[PDB]
Amino acid sequence: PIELLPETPSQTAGPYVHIGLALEAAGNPTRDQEIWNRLAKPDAPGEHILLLGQVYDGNGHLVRDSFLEVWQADANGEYQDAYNLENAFNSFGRTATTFDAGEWTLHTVKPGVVNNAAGVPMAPHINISLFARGINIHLHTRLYFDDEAQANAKCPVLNLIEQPQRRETLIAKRCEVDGKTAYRFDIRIQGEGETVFFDF
Amino acid sequence: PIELLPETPSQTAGPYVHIGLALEAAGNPTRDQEIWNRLAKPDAPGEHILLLGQVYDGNGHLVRDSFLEVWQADANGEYQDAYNLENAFNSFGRTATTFDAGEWTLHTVKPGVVNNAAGVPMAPHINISLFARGINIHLHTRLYFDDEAQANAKCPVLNLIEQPQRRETLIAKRCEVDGKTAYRFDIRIQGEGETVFFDF
Amino acid sequence: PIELLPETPSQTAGPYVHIGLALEAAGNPTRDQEIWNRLAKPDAPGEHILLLGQVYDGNGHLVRDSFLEVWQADANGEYQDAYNLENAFNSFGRTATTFDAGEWTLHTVKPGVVNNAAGVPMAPHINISLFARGINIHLHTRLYFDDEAQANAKCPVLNLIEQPQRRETLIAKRCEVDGKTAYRFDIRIQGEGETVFFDF
Amino acid sequence: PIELLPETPSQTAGPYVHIGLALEAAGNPTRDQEIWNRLAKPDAPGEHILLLGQVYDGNGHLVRDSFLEVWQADANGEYQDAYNLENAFNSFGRTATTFDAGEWTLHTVKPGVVNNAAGVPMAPHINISLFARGINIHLHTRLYFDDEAQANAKCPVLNLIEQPQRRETLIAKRCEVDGKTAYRFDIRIQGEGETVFFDF
Amino acid sequence: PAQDNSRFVIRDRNWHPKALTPDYKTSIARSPRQALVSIPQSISETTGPNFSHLGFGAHDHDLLLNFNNGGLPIGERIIVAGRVVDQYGKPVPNTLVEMWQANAGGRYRHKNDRYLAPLDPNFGGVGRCLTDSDGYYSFRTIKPGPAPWRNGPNDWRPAHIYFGISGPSIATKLITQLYFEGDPLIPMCPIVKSIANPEAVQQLIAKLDMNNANPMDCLAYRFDIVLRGQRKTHFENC
Amino acid sequence: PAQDNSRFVIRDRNWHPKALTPDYKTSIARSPRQALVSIPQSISETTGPNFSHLGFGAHDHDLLLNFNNGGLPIGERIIVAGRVVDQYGKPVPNTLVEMWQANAGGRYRHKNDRYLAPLDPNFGGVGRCLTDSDGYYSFRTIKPGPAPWRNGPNDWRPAHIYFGISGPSIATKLITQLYFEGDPLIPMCPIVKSIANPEAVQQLIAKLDMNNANPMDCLAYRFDIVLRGQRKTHFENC
Amino acid sequence: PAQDNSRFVIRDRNWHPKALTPDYKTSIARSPRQALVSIPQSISETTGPNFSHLGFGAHDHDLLLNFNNGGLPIGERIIVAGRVVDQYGKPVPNTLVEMWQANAGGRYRHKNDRYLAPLDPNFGGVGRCLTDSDGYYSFRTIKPGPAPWRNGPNDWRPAHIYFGISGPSIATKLITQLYFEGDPLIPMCPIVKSIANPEAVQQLIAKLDMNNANPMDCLAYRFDIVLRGQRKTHFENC
Numbered sequence A, B, C, D: 001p002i003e004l005l006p007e008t009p010s011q012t013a014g015p016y017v018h019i020g021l022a023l024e025a026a027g028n029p030t031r032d033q034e035i036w037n038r039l040a041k042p043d044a045p046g047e048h049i050l051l052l053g054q055v056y057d058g059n060g061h062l063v064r065d066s067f068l069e070v071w072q073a074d075a076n077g078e079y080q081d082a083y084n085l086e087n088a089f090n091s092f093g094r095t096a097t098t099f100d101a102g103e104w105t106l107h108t109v110k111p112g113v114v115n116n117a118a119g120v121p122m123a124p125h126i127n128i129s130l131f132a133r134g135i136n137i138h139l140h141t142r143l144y145f146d147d148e149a150q151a152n153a154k155c156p157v158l159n160l161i162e163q164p165q166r167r168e169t170l171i172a173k174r175c176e177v178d179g180k181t182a183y184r185f186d187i188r189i190q191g192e193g194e195t196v197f198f199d200f
Numbered sequence E, F, G: 001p002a003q004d005n006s007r008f009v010i011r012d013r014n015w016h017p018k019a020l021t022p023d024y025k026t027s028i029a030r031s032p033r034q035a036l037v038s039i040p041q042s043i044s045e046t047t048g049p050n051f052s053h054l055g056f057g058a059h060d061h062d063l064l065l066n067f068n069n070g071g072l073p074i075g076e077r078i079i080v081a082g083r084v085v086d087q088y089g090k091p092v093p094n095t096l097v098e099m100w101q102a103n104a105g106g107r108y109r110h111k112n113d114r115y116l117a118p119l120d121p122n123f124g125g126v127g128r129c130l131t132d133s134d135g136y137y138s139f140r141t142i143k144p145g146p147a148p149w150r151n152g153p154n155d156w157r158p159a160h161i162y163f164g165i166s167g168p169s170i171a172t173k174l175i176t177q178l179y180f181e182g183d184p185l186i187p188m189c190p191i192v193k194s195i196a197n198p199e200a201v202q203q204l205i206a207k208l209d210m211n212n213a214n215p216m217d218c219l220a221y222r223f224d225i226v227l228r229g230q231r232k233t234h235f236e237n238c
């Protein structure tokens, strides 16, 4: 058969990932421009939301060295790839769990609806890639919203998860943090309540 | 050493096993004669019973595409191998789980006692072979009866299972379906309460 | 793919074939029973016919060392495989061309119609196998009859010969020899008027 | 030595070539635009002519499944390569033999003179490529005109054919079809009167 | 009735696929985590159904005719034939062979298959027969097409036909899959690769069998099946 | 109009099949017995039609849609794609690629094919396209089935698709046949074996191309085509 | 905004390291036990950030000058350079390449690293750059020392540099580790050996590149990176 050049193989991001990719989180000096956890400035259109979560291993213990990358549509359902710290909104961001701060946070807007390749609407979601010591190739997941039950039930991606009880692992829980709208999205890498991870 | 011809290797029966072995369940027309789940005609000797059960995977979810073959002695402890739809009793039958409820049923008689090769009586049992998508080589088990406690405690096959707690997984529970004597035999392929499976 | 034992490869019958297979034609002493050129005794049912012919090479020169085997239905269209010199009819015979007698002869009856494997009638024919010095594997042909034009035109075997002008090479010419019905069937191995040869 | 990538090897166009290249002849519906046998619209410059011919195998039998491609200069000695069904003249065309009569036709103009690479005029000609079942790589030839005797005698391509008798095989015969000027160009693939075929 | 008069050679469960083969994703949750419990052969295991008295329809072995809704199925006409023997080389006569498959385009006639390739109105996809007195079986069918499936993101089964064979006892009964000589999908398939030994995989590949073809009609493939060796009991209970 | 501005590398007629290959029976009477006459390249040979202004229909390259009589064709959905280059490795852009084939069962939609395997009412079997600016072409189709034919008594073509490619001149134009990776009929075929060199045969075998497949939809094969090398003229007439 | 116009070749997850590789002890509890769920590519997966207008500082790619506290760092001066391409061999221009590493003694500038080998006051161990318009990147740094770690009782990482590459989409994003030609620790490392295929491990080994060295100044290593092949969509939703 036709065999292309093989992809460079993945390796773990290791325990010191923050020194390269989360400098402030590493407690190290930062450069003038950093890619971090504020996707939306106050002026961005849409519903401003705080996202937060903890990451657990197969023994139910906190993962205190996680690094997360996120990719989401703006409030109008458009992906914005022109990354610039001057933008009121960026579709991409980074966050981390650390020894001092075991709960990651993101400051963003709720993403608008995006159609899949067949033209079928997907429920509002944030794409997440999870890296850490012990993770040899990053884990892909999606964060959906518990206040989008109708859309979630019809999402062509959620519906590829064979068991309804596993779909529930991808649904973030709405709360309020200091009077502001928030959602908690905890990830369980292994075992009871294991978070659905995707391949694509 | 002496090496015979290798046996043809097993493969999964796949999710469409019912096309070939359970035609109605596939949604398809049947042939004049089908091997199915009614082992006993109404006037076969012995105690007429319903057997039923559900099959669970390692996550506790129903296996809705199971296919089961059964082999049992008649009420007089005789294996009737000359398969014929006109027989009062057939020792062989087939069943499958409903896709909606995941429940299989078998209509039979309670099997009589047969001796092992050393002449020691075995408790009344029905030999089962389980096939499905995800199962690469079929799983052998036995269904014994909870109202045969004395015989069960002396069975030379049950006593080869080292742990009493695991012996319990092979004991079907007497119940009533539509007012008729039945025994429920659930199978757990993996994990908590995992059903004993045999090699022979 | 599946490869069977290879067939023993053919070789030429060589210039001395008659010493083994046509003893009288070789001018050598004969044994008590010989397979020869009289398929029909006078008492055989059907139309008694004399067949005769010459064999030519690619330069138009006579082949004076040919050996021919023939296989035909009786007048009722039945092949008779129980070869016996006591029979009024045998379906099999042998003839030859020699230095003294360059024109072979056969004494037989006109064969009846035989159906092909699809049940379609074939025109009356004699199957011929031709052997000689220079012929590495024998050549198969058929002798049909010029007074069976209607049947010949509809023969499913003749109709597999793509060119009508090549079909004519298989049609023997009716004549009279000493007041008796005869047909001449000349064979041209190579070149102008080359006789159709079959593979099967 | 320097060895380039090998050319893809040729294979026969097969007996069903017309499915792909002569759709009507296959018995099939045509597409909006087809490359076919009318090179010249009625008002194309030059002398409008019909070309026709039959193709013979080595036994003198018609090749009823021929497929021919032609390439010729326009009346002004120009090769028109920008193929378009709206062109007054196309230098390229296709034709095929009728299965019944084995005759191909082309509607064109008499080509003007073009020079060879050394600047020597070639006689008026149409380049032909012949394809069919049984032809493993297509055969190249040229059709010249019998009313161009003076030019033909001086053609540097015709003069590369060592034997005058063989040069005659490339000379089409002026005739009249339906009262209109035509030239007949029969091709004999093999044997007596074998048409000259070229390599270049 | 049946009697205990034979023993069957113990299976090599490293020749067969293991239960847990995670590249075949559905195996992860459908594989026992505890060891199988070995038990000695008794009459329960060394007997099984014989199907000599099952009534077969005229076309039960002929998938070109057994789902006839006005024409022939589209696709590559093939005979699939072979012999069932045990590990000692003894033929297994009068044994039930069942088979099922997708159509020429890899679509199954099953309510749960929604692959976009069309069903064939004259193809059902199920066959059965008994081996003859010398152990031989024969089916006529269409060569199935590769079937995409939701395992990895671009997984395709090689062309395959499912087989079930009863044999002399419940200890011999087997389900397997036949693959076709040369299919470039075979080395790529996680179901094929559930079998760890490459020589075992080769035993599932049917060979083109020109000797058994009907000219101008159908090709043929040969697929021989080996069931567990059967021997008489000896020196037991003494 | 066209001009003479290039030369084409001379063909290797021992790499191509020879004319007389008697195991392919129809070649015996359709092969010239006289030598080909070599002639130098002139404008007549070094020019040819370009098809950039031919009007193509929307589905001309898509055999799943271009003979639509109420449904999809039955059989193995495949993309057949590749690149046309010359012997120097230069892409051949904007060139005409035509293809034709039997259906999934080896039956041709031609009045002269009376093979008993049925026609598919939604399959025609003809495609065409132009290579793009980088030399690439693409078709979508059904994998054709082997086709029996009246050569020897049990002869079967491997699965094959006919290709015609125009290229820059009448000197480059080629018809060939594509075969499929692994097909056990390839080594047996007298038409394939008209090519004497085994390495040349390999150049006609399309490779399974999973990278180009549409998951849950269609597989893909890759078939690259090499036309005669084109160079500028040099040191002529001096 | 970003558009869905491309597809990315599916990953070979037996070429990459698997999740559960127990000799790398931390993977035991940080590996999912359920199968990954395959999903089709949509605009969510086939787009990603472009960093063309991220503001880079003058020394962001030069670890000899980007942590300047009064001198040069101690250790082997090296350039690390290479090309980013996709599996079709197409360069990946203007893509973000980030890297980080220990100092010459195997000590990381992170509070959680308490290895007794000292920090270097003039070394920070962090770089970033964009590939140029032809897909090339280059860093200047110190060759890192092997780093001991609490896995087995005497485990030492080979000298290594972490790499992160964005590529055209979130589907192409990769983190990996570069190792150095000849390092005898490479065959011993349970993190290297998380990759099962030895040919894949070889893809992570940077080669000494004397051609790119500055004489009397610094050596050079070459490390090329291959991201998933990108192709246009074809024959979708039809």
Ligand SMILES: [Fe+3]
Residues within 6 Å of the ligand: A014, G147, G157, G160
């Ligand atoms: Fe490290």
Ligand SMILES: [Fe+3]
Residues within 6 Å of the ligand: B014, E147, E157, E160
């Ligand atoms: Fe299947």
Ligand SMILES: [Fe+3]
Residues within 6 Å of the ligand: C014
């Ligand atoms: Fe001799």
Ligand SMILES: [Fe+3]
Residues within 6 Å of the ligand: D014, F147, F157, F160
């Ligand atoms: Fe063909």
